[PDB]
From a paper:
The final step in the pathway is catalyzed by a 2-epimerase, which utilizes UDP-2,3-diacetamido-2,3-dideoxy-d-glucuronic acid as its substrate.
Note that the α-carbons for the apoform of the WT enzyme and the D98N variant correspond with an RMSD of 0.9 Å.
Numbering used by the authors:
A (entry chain B): 2 to 360
B (entry chain A): 1 to 361
The structure:
């Protein structure tokens, strides 16, 4: 009764598509096609990703990437269009806001194949921010806009997109975090290995240039974390670049003052996030995950894209100026929680999307 | 110091718009220009006549792309245009009209953070399945500056959240061009002498579209009507040899005998005939605009036009070809009408206004 073709580029997009698929594959009368724009990866770490996160095997890998925006986008546009002319789907789903997303939407729309944009209406309002142009043009190219927030809805209305193409469904990444959260609790040994209890540690990740490329900020961070560790163990899966910078700056020994690890796989990282007493991070994605698992977050930046998390008191900016102050900030936010309300849907965004598709 | 302004063009109407802008840019200190054509160089006779008569410069680049699907053409043009932008490093990219070339140019530039100005911004049919509608929308939302032809286009842009400070009402550079080529036609074209015609002593017909040329009922209505008009006032009908044979085939060749049926004429000869006609009968959107520019009443043999403003100012009139008697009467009646004396598409100096805005910023 309906053929639904998903275009995905980067890993976040596979995760969103997998969540939607978990609903679509339960729907009798839906045929699904998964088009990956990039290459297959045979490496062990990659195979584990697809397997442990239950990602469907793509029907296509177009192999495109490594070039400029114009080469990657233009080749994807032609190649995706080739697939659409063979598969003739009733719907094309595009996800996130990369060049793959835009290429998928532009390929479909000129063939008059209805396009639905999963994660529509996000705006930085900075036309030069990486994904801002992709966000705007994907949204204006699409037939259905699945917004994660009311702010995104309003963003879309403001640009003259009509209300009847806009549907507030929430963030499928919340759905995915609940699914992987349950699976981690079943499968992950990371807390057993480290000898840690649920709610008995702080998780830290640091990888942004603003922190890792400044000798002074990185010293402040690492010293602050070493001080926090004395009170509550600090688990710090250190990004390899962060490690490299620490070592070059002569800051290596501080990592010996916390539980410093090599990066861990996805399910192990979910297990650490959901069971942390608090998360300290400069990652935008990790800030959202903290909220999804109702774990207080301290963001070691002077700003964040997710102001809604600050307003809801789940997240808290802590610029790394002084090690004592940062440590004390973290220790204090450890005993806070934010507003128990939903910012990004109820974890069932996937069913709401499917409902508008299976019509 | 100076600005490098690179123009992307992909269809003949874009060449005309860019040349009009360029006639101003090249007289203005502090500008270097680069012209990129997405398609091929041609050496047939009619193409050479296009470039020579309409004063179109040979592009600095011909990307040689065309003839494929939307995805093929657009995707290849996007990569190929970007290549040129990385070499030329312009300060501004200008894109024109609303074709796949336009969009490819805008998208190539915007991801390099090269300012884009869209000439002919804000047009909307409000039907996202009309040919160029997605192109219009996406080009508009990709652009840094929007050069709107009408107040309507300005409102369309504001209604999609584009702020007033990026929208400039300049008019339609096609009007500038029509005045340029009109003056040139009056200096150079001898077509009226050649035909023994007097200015305002004839009707011009041009029938281009398949909905008409390929349906024997509609084509008969048109040619039967014209042959009727011809008994009161000469009808000049430059007919493509295709459309001529299509008419011979449907059995209508005696009608082409009655009127002054011609082989295709050159561009300036057509301009000369248009501007000096008592009335123009056409199914071409472009000709409908030229009729208005030259203040010649127009009758459009279709059930619709996009250019509704011409209908509402009474310069144009829809007469779908269902009834030869009534079509002939409509022509005879409308050839003694005029529209409302109003400028719909600017003052004929849209090019100067674009140039002034670009050179300022
Ligand atoms: Cl993504
Ligand atoms: Na609640």
């Amino acid at each position: 009764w309906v053929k639904i073709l998903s275009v995905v580029g980067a890993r976040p997009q596979f995760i969103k598509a997998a969540a939607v698929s978990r609903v679509l594959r339960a729907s009798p009368g839906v045929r699904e096609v998964l088009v990956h724009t990039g290459q297959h990866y045979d490496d062990n770490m990659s195979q584990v990703f697809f397997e442990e996160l239950e990602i469907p095997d793509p029907d296509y890998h177009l192999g495109i990437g490594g070039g400029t925006h114009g080469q990657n986008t233009g080749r994807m546009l032609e190649a995706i269009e080739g697939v659409l002319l063979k598969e003739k789907p009733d719907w094309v789903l595009v996800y996130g806001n990369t060049d793959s997303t835009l290429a998928g939407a532009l390929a479909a729309v000129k063939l008059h194949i209805p396009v639905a944009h999963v994660e529509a209406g996000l705006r930085s309002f900075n036309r030069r921010m990486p994904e801002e142009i992709n966000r705007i043009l994907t949204d204006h190219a699409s037939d259905l806009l699945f917004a994660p927030t009311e702010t995104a809805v309003q963003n879309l209305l403001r640009e003259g997109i009509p209300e009847n193409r806009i549907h507030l469904v929430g963030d499928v990444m919340y759905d995915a975090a609940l699914h992987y959260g349950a699976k981690a609790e079943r499968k992950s040994r990371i807390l057993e290995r480290l000898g840690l209890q649920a709610k008995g540690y702080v998780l830290a990740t640091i990888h942004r240039a603003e922190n890792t490329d400044d000798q002074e900020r990185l010293r402040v961070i690492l010293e602050a974390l070493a001080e926090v560790h004395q009170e509550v163990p600090v688990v710090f899966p250190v990004h390899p670049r962060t490690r490299k910078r620490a070592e070059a700056f002569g800051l290596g020994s501080y990592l010996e003052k916390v539980v410093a690890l090599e990066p861990v796989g996805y399910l192990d990282m979910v297990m650490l996030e959901k069971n942390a007493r608090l998360i300290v991070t400069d990652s935008g994605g990790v800030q959202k995950e903290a909220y999804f698992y109702r774990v207080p977050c301290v963001t070691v930046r002077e700003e964040t894209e997710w102001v809604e998390l600050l307003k809801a008191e789940w997240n808290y900016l802590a610029a790394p100026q002084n090690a004592k102050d940062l440590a004390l900030t973290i220790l204090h936010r450890m005993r806070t929680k934010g507003v128990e309300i939903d910012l990004y849907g109820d974890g069932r965004a996937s069913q709401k999307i499917s409902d508008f598709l299976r019509k």
